[PDB]
């Protein structure tokens, strides 16, 4: 209808003792302005004029005593929307026979009704954010109900036993009912369409089974005490099923594989999940399948081969995992992410078109001779073990190595390793020197090597990132090589002041004055910048850093262009007493002095302090 939009400017109409009070089907109020009582004559409280569409927008800590007098005396209240109700219970004079919608999206209710009332034609009931609600009414005789959205009702201890009789329910949003401890059995014909139980930190029991012919979503994203899961009968058209962080889940319903249209399954955090059901392979179009931190998952079923569409198989921290299925060829597998699976003890050979193979922390210790039959691997990462020399077929395919803490010396045969693009040392507390590395190298993350004083290489990859965090022991010829290696990316080093080789130093700030070495006979000029960070609270794990660069001339005013114009690295560490270097490229500048302003994106994480540069 055309709503009577009024804000305290309809309350004067109702004071009139004429019949003008009657014949108001719809009322729409907005009570943002605070007042305890509307200025209404006591004679208008006697008049029994009815409303059918009531839309009131309440105010916090403003219990309108008179407004409740006129509203709930209306016999045929078809609709009701009272945000911020601000009363303990609905008045006892309420007649809800013709109620079709109910909506109290913020409230201080504690129990709606005293007894079993008639709800013959109620079709919607939104009671969201009613943090003080204690119990729902007797929802029997509410057959035509469709939705029941109890979102974020913290204090709701238990759902009514009469939920079984809501034979028309479609949506049941119980999002963050942190105190609900049991979901009652629903019935044989309800056919919920959206069963949302996202953050029920104290939910324990669930229905033994629910009809699921028309079911699309079923979310339990932090239910930490759900012991088992109701059987999903048909699930012909599930769209979403996520059980993130659902610990204490011991098994899975054997009918979970009936969901033949599901395309993404997420079980991250599902600790104490012993084994997947044998019907998993029944799923079709299952493209993405996350498992992470799934301890006690001791085996992975061999029915996977039926999937034929799996693309991503993430498996991190699966400590107890022992044996992957054998003699399968996943046709469309793309990445096998098996990191920190301590007890793998056997190479993963479950496909032939894998492109990203991540095997770090696994106690694998062999490589099969069958890999030359595989498709080329764009990323094959395995943590180094001593008995790797016996596999010449594994050296030319490998891409990333990872030396462990207890490595006495990097083997000299690393130079033979052809397609190597990274070498990460993780707190190599007993090391001395690094040998010559293959020229395909593009990353060198010496994380916290206590003693790595010697570098005996000459890197010649134009895009190499020589990060040496917290690696203090280093002879000056090593520190010279790290700084003076020509690379278009960053370079880390432990230091306390910007070195002397960067002549044109400047104080802590974003204003560098440099002078051109000569009349610019070469058109282009090359600059090597150095940067420290302002000492400020630094998290032990700060791992993101980006830099902006702007060059402007002061002798003649013009914003000279810069070719790199930014350096970004999402793997570099952010540490206080460390030196960051990079490269700069410029045009042919008609001037003779330039100003460099090395700002930094994300000024809330790290700011650039001392920074001096040089010209090559």
């Amino acid at each position: 209808h055309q709503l009577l939009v009024g804000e305290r400017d309809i309350c004067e109409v109702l004071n009139d003792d004429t019949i003008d009070s009657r014949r108001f089907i719809g009322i729409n109020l907005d009570l943002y302005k605070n007042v305890e009582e509307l200025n209404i004559s006591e004679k208008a409280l006697e008049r029994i004029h009815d409303f059918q569409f009531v839309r009131i927008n309440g105010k916090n800590h403003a219990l309108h005593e008179r407004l409740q007098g006129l509203i709930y005396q209306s016999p045929q209240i078809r609709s009701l929307h009272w945000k911020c109700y601000q009363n303990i219970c609905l008045p006892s004079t309420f007649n809800s026979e013709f109620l079709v919608e109910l909506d109290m999206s913020f409230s201080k209710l504690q129990k709606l009704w005293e007894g079993t009332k008639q709800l013959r034609n109620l079709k919607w009931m939104d009671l969201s954010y009613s943090s003080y609600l204690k119990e729902l009414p007797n929802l029997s005789t509410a057959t035509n109900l469709e939705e029941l959205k109890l979102r974020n009702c913290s204090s709701l201890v238990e759902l009514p036993s009469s939920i079984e009789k809501l034979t028309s329910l479609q949506i049941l949003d119980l999002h963050r009912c942190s105190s609900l401890v049991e979901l009652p059995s629903f019935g044989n014909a309800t056919k919920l369409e959206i069963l949302n139980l996202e953050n029920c930190s104290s939910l324990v029991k669930l229905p033994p089974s629910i009809n699921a012919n028309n079911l699309q979503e079923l979310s339990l994203t932090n239910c930490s005490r759900v012991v088992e899961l109701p059987a999903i009968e048909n699930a012909t058209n599930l769209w979403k099923l996520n059980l993130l962080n659902c610990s204490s889940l011991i098994e899975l319903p054997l009918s979970i594989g009936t969901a033949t249209n599901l395309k993404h399954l997420d079980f991250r955090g599902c600790s104490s999940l012993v084994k997947l059901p044998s019907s998993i392979g029944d799923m079709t179009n299952l493209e993405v399948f996350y498992l992470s931190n799934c301890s006690n998952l001791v085996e992975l079923p061999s029915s996977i081969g039926n999937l034929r569409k799996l693309t991503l198989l993430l498996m991190r921290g699966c400590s107890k995992l022992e044996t992957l299925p054998t003699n399968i060829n996943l046709k469309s597998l793309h990445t096998l992410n098996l990191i920190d699976c301590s007890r793998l003890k056997s190479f993963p050979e479950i496909s032939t078109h894998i492109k990203y193979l991540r095997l770090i922390g696994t106690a694998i210790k062999e490589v099969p001779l069958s890999i030359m039959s595989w498709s080329p691997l764009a990323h094959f990462q395995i943590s180094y073990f001593e008995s790797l020399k016996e596999f010449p077929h594994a050296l030319d395919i490998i891409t990333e190595l990872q030396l462990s803490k207890d490595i006495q010396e990097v083997p000299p045969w690393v130079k033979r390793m052809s397609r190597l693009r990274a070498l990460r040392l993780n707190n190599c507390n007993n090391l001395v020197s690094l040998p010559q590395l293959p020229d395909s190298l593009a990353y060198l993350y010496a994380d916290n090597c206590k003693s790595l004083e010697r570098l005996d290489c000459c890197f010649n990859n134009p895009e190499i990132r020589l990060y040496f965090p917290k690696c203090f022991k280093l002879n000056q010829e090593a520190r010279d090589l790290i700084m003076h290696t020509s690379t278009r990316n960053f370079a880390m080093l432990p230091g306390t002041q910007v070195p002397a080789c960067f002549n044109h130093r400047a104080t802590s700030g974003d204003s560098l004055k440099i002078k051109l070495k000569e009349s610019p006979l070469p058109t282009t000029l090359t600059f090597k910048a150095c940067i420290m960070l302002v000492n400020e609270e630094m998290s032990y794990d700060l791992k993101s850093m980006s830099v902006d660069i702007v060059i402007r001339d002061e002798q003649n005013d013009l914003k000279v262009q810069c070719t790199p114009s930014y350096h970004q690295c999402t793997e570099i560490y952010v540490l206080t007493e460390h030196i960051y270097t990079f490269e700069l490229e410029v045009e042919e500048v008609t001037s003779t002095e330039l100003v460099f302003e090395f700002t930094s994106v994300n000024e809330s994480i790290c700011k650039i302090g001392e920074c001096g540069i040089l010209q090559r």
Partner: protein, 235 residues
Amino acid sequence: PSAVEALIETIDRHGRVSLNDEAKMKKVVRTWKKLIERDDLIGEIGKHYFEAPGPLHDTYDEALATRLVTTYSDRGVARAILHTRPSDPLSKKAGQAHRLEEAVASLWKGRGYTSDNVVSSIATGHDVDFFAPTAFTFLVKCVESEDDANNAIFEYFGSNPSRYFSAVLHAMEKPDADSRVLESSKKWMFQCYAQKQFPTPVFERTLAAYQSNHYEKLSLSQIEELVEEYSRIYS
């Protein structure tokens, strides 16, 4: 071209163009809204950016979040998250928005951000905005506990209970403010002054001393609300 190709080329151009801070704060919201228009975009672009050369990630959402944060800064992403909240939580748009927001939260956790870094990234300039639900829920998502989020907001105010109480009282006026959470924050402040064995009635004069960027200087020292309540809740 199609929607996916157009949005990918837009993101790439924005990333490499080195645009102004206000320009990025304006374009991030447009791109962000384009992302959640249909439910087949986040997955497809996440899959495209997963396979592209670069660092290796664990999920598609992490790849998309990494590219978005790299293109538009940490503050731009938070701006887009706070100002693009759909109405119905059970819609498709709200589902896509929650996917993006959770991906960004996990991105920030994976880089070892503290509570202060997250708060300074969310920080808009008005002290009342930290208690709006669309920002408080994201902050709790990033710090995993309401106590830590409240402590972070308290420390961002220079450990000043006057400014904190002024902000909470202003957040009480908000129309869609989850009053349970606001009383949770107020109760947390009362508690942290309570178990400290600081049950002095001087809480009134401590507030008066701590009161006079800038903020509304509560003159309403709530001699009962912010005093008698502390008086009879504990000791």
